[PDB]
Amino acid sequence: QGMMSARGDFLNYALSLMRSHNDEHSDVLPVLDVCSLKHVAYVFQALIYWIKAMNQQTTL
Amino acid sequence: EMASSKKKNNFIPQPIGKCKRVFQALLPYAVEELCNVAESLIVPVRMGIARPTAPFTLASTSIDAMQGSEELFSVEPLPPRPSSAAQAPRSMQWAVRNTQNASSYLTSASSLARAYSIVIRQISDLMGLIPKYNHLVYSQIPAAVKLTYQDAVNLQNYVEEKLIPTWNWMVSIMDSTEAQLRYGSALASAGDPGHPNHPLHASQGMMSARGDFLNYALSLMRSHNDEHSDVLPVLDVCSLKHVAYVFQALIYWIKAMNQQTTLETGQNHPFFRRSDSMTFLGCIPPNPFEVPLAEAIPLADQPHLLQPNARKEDLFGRPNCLEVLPTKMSYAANLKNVMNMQNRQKKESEGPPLTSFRPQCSFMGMVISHDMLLGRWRLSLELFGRVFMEDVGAEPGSILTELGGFEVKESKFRREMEKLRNQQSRDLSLEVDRDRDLLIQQTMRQLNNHFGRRCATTPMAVHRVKVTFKDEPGEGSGVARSFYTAIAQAFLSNEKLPNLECIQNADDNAPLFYQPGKRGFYTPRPGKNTEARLNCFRNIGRILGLCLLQNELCPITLNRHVIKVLLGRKVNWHDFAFFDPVMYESLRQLILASQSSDADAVFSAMDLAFAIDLCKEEGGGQVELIPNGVNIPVTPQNVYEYVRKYAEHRMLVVAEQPLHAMRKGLLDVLPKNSLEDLTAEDFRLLVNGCGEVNVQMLISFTSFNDESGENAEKLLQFKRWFWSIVEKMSMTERQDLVYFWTSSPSLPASEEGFQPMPSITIRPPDDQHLPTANTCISRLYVPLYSSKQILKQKLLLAIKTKNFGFV
Amino acid sequence: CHKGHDCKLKRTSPTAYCDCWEKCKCKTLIAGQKSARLDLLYRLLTATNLVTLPNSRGEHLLLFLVQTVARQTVEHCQYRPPDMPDHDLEPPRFAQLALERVLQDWNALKSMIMFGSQENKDPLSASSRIGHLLPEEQVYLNQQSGTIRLDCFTHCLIVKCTADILLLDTLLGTLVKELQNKYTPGRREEAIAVTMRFLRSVARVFVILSVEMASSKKKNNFIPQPIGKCKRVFQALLPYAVEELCNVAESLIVPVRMGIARPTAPFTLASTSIDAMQGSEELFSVEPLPPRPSSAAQAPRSMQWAVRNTQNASSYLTS
C-alpha cells in the first residue's frame, strides 16, 4: 500500500490545492497537515508578541 | 503520474493529448487558467507551506497512470445529515551534504516543482503556438477560439505578471548560491591547502547537529553584511532540488521567448574561429593571438591531459540586471537588488497578423538570452549538472544535459553501436602473425576480402570480431583486443614497411605514420601516394570503426585534426596546435609581427613565401601552399592566408589522400550520423582511451585473485606495494605496464569500457621469475615478491620486454 | 624564555608545575618594578602607534590581552598565600590593567573593531596576497571582510570574562562618547561605522547563546551573564542595536520564509549556562584560513483530519 498510498495522497493534495484556488471545494475536506506548520507557529507567536507589546504600550 | 520517456517519442498518450487539445481549442482562456493553476502549485513550495509526503514512483505505462487517477476521480459528494548524483569537484564538494515510507518536506517540494514545471512547459507551448495559430487550428481542431495580435500581447504580459514573483524568488536564491560557490573557489585558490579548514583539505551526534546548526546561523549572519572573508559559506545543495526544478522551467520560458524572436584574411574567417568544446558558455573567448599556446590551450600543451571526467575549464583554459554579477551571498540583498533594478524598468485580427507576432522577454531586464544566465549561474549549473543530473536532469527539455560530460555522449554513442551491432549476424575473422610485416600484410588482405565480398557502399555492421594468431591459436574477443594494439603499433613504428602492393590482391615502404613537431603523437605519412598505400589506409579506418562497434580500444595515437577528418568536420587553426605546438607558436608570433609598425620589413627580412619545406616523414621536398606559391611573398596583410594555408597544408594536404581513405574506412563500418554528437575529444576517448594512465582509474576497476594461500593482510601489503610502484612509473612506463597487462597501453574511458574487468592474480612467492599476463582476459600474474624493490625491478623489466612470452 | 624555539602545546593533564626555572636559563623569574612597568606602558601607548599593530600571528593587541586576562583569571584563582627561586609570590595584574587601558584608546579600539576590514587589511595569515590571482577571484575575494578575530574577541569579552564587567562598560562608554562627538567632523560617521560593526559581532554572539540556552519553564531572573551582557550592549546602543537586530531577524527568517533553509539534524537545548557556553567555544575557537605559501495533545474529531500524527538524520522541518 506504501507506494500507491504516497501517490494517492500527493495527487489528492494537488487536487485539493487546485480546487481551493477557485472556491470549488464544497463537498470534500481540504487536504491539510498541521505537523508541517511548526515553524510558522513559532513565527506566529513572535509576531503576536510584537503587536501585543504595542498594545501594552498603548495601555501603559 | 506519467513518467517522461528518456527516448524522444510522439506517443503523447490520449489522456494528456486530449487535455492539450482542449487547451489549444480554448487557448486564450486556457493560458490564463493554467497560469492560475501554476500559481497554486508554486505557492506551497515558494512559501514553505507544502505538506510533507512520502515518495512514489512515476508510472511508466499510461495504463497504470490512468488507474491511479481512477482512485482519485471515483469519488462521491458527502451527503447531508438525514432528517430525524555524480560526484562534485573538490572545490565544490564542501557545498553538498552527501556521500560523494516516511514523509518529508523536500519530497513534496520537489514533486510540486515537477508539477509546476509541467504547467509552465504547457504555457510556453501554448504561447509558442500563437504565431502559427491561424494554421494549426484548422489543420488540428474543428473549432477553436479566435485570438488577435493585441490578445497575444496581453497574454504575454499576463503570463509574465503571474510568473515574475516566482522569478524574483528563484533569482535571489540562485544568485546567493553562485556567489557562495565563486567565493569558495577564490578562497580555495588563495588559501593554503595544507590548512585543515581549507576546502580542498576537507575534500558526536547531538553535538554535531548543534554545531552545524549554530555554524549555519553564524554564516547567515555574516553573509548579510559581507563579513565572510575567511570562512567557507555554510551551504547544502541537496536542499535545492525543488528550486532546481523551478529553475529549469523558468529558463525554459525565457528560452522559448528567445526562440520566438529567432524563429578573407580576417580573424573572422572560419579557420581562425574557436571550435567545438573551446567556446565557453556566454563567455567571450580570450583572443588566441594574445594568449600563448601554453596558456590558451592547456590540452594542447599536454595532449594526454584529457580525461573522461576532466573539467572543460582546465582543458581549454579558465575564463542589465544580469550583466551585474551575483556578488552577494545573503539572499535578502539579492532579492532587494533584483527588485530595485526591476522597479527602474517597471516605472480576423486588426492590423498585424499573428504570424507577425514578435514576443520577447523584455522585463526584469531589457533583453535576456539564456547564454547570459548560463554564464551568470555557471558554477551553480556545473554543480547541479552532477548532483541533480539523475533527477532534475532527467526532465523533458532538461537544461542540465547541456552540462553532460564524456559519459553522457558515450551513453548515446553506445546505444547507437548496440542498435547497429545487433542488426547483423555475420562476424569478422582474421588470422594473422605477430611479426610486424606479416601482420600488416595479412590483416589488410583479409580485410579487403571481407569488405569486397560484402556491399562496399553499406557499413560493415558485424556482431563480433574474432581474431586468431598463427601458431598461437587463441580465439575470440581477447585475441582481437591484443590484435588491435599489435596492428596499431605496427602502424606507428618508424621501421620500413613491407610492400603494400601485396594488399591489392584481395616500393612505397615508407612508414604509415610519423610524429610531427615535438609530440609522440602521429599524423599519416603520405609516402609515394600509391593506390596500395591508400588501400591500407582505408582498411585502417575500417579497423577504427570495428573497434568502436565492438566497444574495444584501438591505440593509434592520432592527432586531433586527423580525428576531426574522421568525424567528418572541419579543421581549424586551433587544431594546428595539436599537429605541431612549436610551429603553432612561431606562426602565432608571425601574426603578432604583422601588427608591428615594421611588419613590412620583418616579413621581407624573413624571406617568407607561400611555399614550405617538408621533412622526410612528410614526403620531403618543397611543396607550394598555393599555385605559384614559390613566387608569391608572404606579407603582413596576407599573413593569415599564409598561416592558414601552412596549417591546412601540413594537417590535410600533405596527407589528404591517406586522410580521405581513413575517413571512408571509418564510414565503411559506421554510419556518419553516429559521429555527429562526438567531438575530437570524445572520439579520442572512445578510440584511443586515456593517453594518460590514470592509476586510480585502473585501480578502481581491478579485482585481485589469490593463488598463494597467504593471509589477507600480507596480500594487502603486497597490493599496496604494486600500486605505489605503478604511481611512480613514468608515463612511458605506465603505458608499457598497461600494455603488458592488457595488450593495450591506453585505459578505457569508462567502467563500461572493460569487458570483462581487469584483474591481478598473486602467485606464490618467487623472487627469480618475472610477472606474466594473459592479456586476452586482461589478467596479470605477479609473484608474491619478498620485497618492494624486487617487485619494482621485475615488473619494469617484464613490461619493457615487449618480447612477451607465450603465456 | 623559549621565544623562537620549537614549542608545542602538550596534551597531558594540565595539573603540573613549570620546569623552565630548573632546566633552563629562565628569564621570567624576575618581576621587576611593577610601577615602572605600568608607567612605561602608559608612556608607550600615548607616545607611539604601536598599539595598532598585530603580532607575528596577526593577532591584535586587544585580542592578545583579552585572552591573556581570561587565562590569568583561571590560573591566578589557584594561588594561595603561604638555588630555588622565591615562590608563593603574588601574581601579576599587568595584563588586566593593560586591557583596561588599551580599551580607552579610540585608535586601539577602532583598529580592533575595523580589523579584517578592507581598509584594515591583515597582512599575515589572512588572504593578504591577492595580486597574483586572476581578476574574477580578486573582485570576489576582496569584497568580503573578516570578523573571526572580532567575533572571538567579543566572545571572550562576554563569555569568558565571567569575573568582570568593567571591560565591557569601558568599550561601550568609548563607543557612546565617540557617537556623541557631534562637534568633530567625520569622526561622527566613523564612530557610527565602528559601532555598527561591533553591534553585528555582539548580535552574532547573542543569537548563538540565546538559541543554545534552554528557556526555563519556571520564571527565573537568572538571566545568565552571556546573554545579559548582550542585552546590556543593546540597551547602551539601543537606537542602533534595534536596526542591526532587525537585519539579523531578516537574515534568520528569509531561509525559512523562502524555503531555502538547509536540513539539519535535531539537537537538545542546553539546560545549564555552562554547557551552552562550551558549545559556543567550538564555534568561536576558529582561526582564519591562511594564504597559499610562497614557493502533542490529541485533536478533537472535527479537526483530527487536519493532523498527520498518531493522535540522527537531517530534515527541513527541524531546521
Swiss-Prot record, chain B:
Tissues in which the UniProt entry reports expression: Widely expressed. Most abundant in testis and expressed at high levels in brain, pituitary and kidney.
Domain of life assignment: Eukaryota
Coiled coil: none
Localization: Nucleus; Cytoplasm
Stretches assigned to the HECT domain: 507-807
Effect of A798W: Strongly reduced E3 ubiquitin-protein ligase activity
In-chain residues carrying the UniProt-annotated modification Phosphothreonine: T279, T401
Effect the entry attributes to changing C776 to A/S: Loss of E3 ubiquitin-protein ligase activity
Effect the entry attributes to changing E227R: Impaired tetramerization
Modified residues (Phosphoserine): S40, S108, S275, S277, S429, S477
Active-site residues (renumbered): C776 (glycyl thioester intermediate)
Similarity remark: Belongs to the UBR5 family.
Quaternary organization: Homotetramer; composed of a dimer of dimers. Associates with CDK9 and TFIIS/TCEA1 and forms a transcription regulatory complex made of CDK9, RNAP II, UBR5 and TFIIS/TCEA1 that can stimulate target gene transcription (e.g. gamma fibrinogen/FGG) by recruiting their promoters. Associates with the E3 ligase complex containing DYRK2, EDD/UBR5, DDB1 and DCAF1 proteins (EDVP complex). Binds TOPBP1. Interacts with PIH1D1. Interacts with CIB1.
Protein role: E3 ubiquitin-protein ligase involved in different protein quality control pathways in the cytoplasm and nucleus. Mainly acts as a ubiquitin chain elongator that extends pre-ubiquitinated substrates. Component of the N-end rule pathway: ubiquitinates proteins bearing specific N-terminal residues that are destabilizing according to the N-end rule, leading to their degradation. Recognizes type-1 N-degrons, containing positively charged amino acids (Arg, Lys and His).
Comment, domains: The UBR-type zinc finger forms a pocket that mediates recognition of type 1 N-degrons.
Name the UniProt record assigns to this protein: E3 ubiquitin-protein ligase UBR5
Organism of this sequence: Homo sapiens (Human)
Full protein stretch here: 1442 to 2799 of 2799
Curated annotation (Swiss-Prot), chain C:
Domain of life: Eukaryota
Binding-site positions, Zn(2+) 3: C1, C20, C26
Tissue-wise expression: Widely expressed. Most abundant in testis and expressed at high levels in brain, pituitary and kidney.
Subcellular location(s) per record: Nucleus; Cytoplasm
UniProt binding sites for Zn(2+) 2: H2, H5
Positions contributing to Zn(2+) 1 binding: C18
Phosphoserine: modified positions: S13, S125, S145, S251, S319
Oligomeric and partner information: Homotetramer; composed of a dimer of dimers. Associates with CDK9 and TFIIS/TCEA1 and forms a transcription regulatory complex made of CDK9, RNAP II, UBR5 and TFIIS/TCEA1 that can stimulate target gene transcription (e.g. gamma fibrinogen/FGG) by recruiting their promoters. Associates with the E3 ligase complex containing DYRK2, EDD/UBR5, DDB1 and DCAF1 proteins (EDVP complex). Binds TOPBP1. Interacts with PIH1D1. Interacts with CIB1. (Microbial infection) Interacts with human T-cell leukemia virus 1/HTLV-1 protein HBZ; this interaction modulates HBZ stability.
Described function: E3 ubiquitin-protein ligase involved in different protein quality control pathways in the cytoplasm and nucleus. Mainly acts as a ubiquitin chain elongator that extends pre-ubiquitinated substrates. Component of the N-end rule pathway: ubiquitinates proteins bearing specific N-terminal residues that are destabilizing according to the N-end rule, leading to their degradation. Recognizes type-1 N-degrons, containing positively charged amino acids (Arg, Lys and His).
Domains (record comment): The UBR-type zinc finger forms a pocket that mediates recognition of type 1 N-degrons. The UBA domain recognizes and binds ubiquitin. It acts as an ubiquitin acceptor required to place 'Lys-48' of ubiquitin into the HECT domain activie site, thereby potentiating the E3 ubiquitin-protein ligase activity.
Family: Belongs to the UBR5 family.
Name of the protein in its database record: E3 ubiquitin-protein ligase UBR5
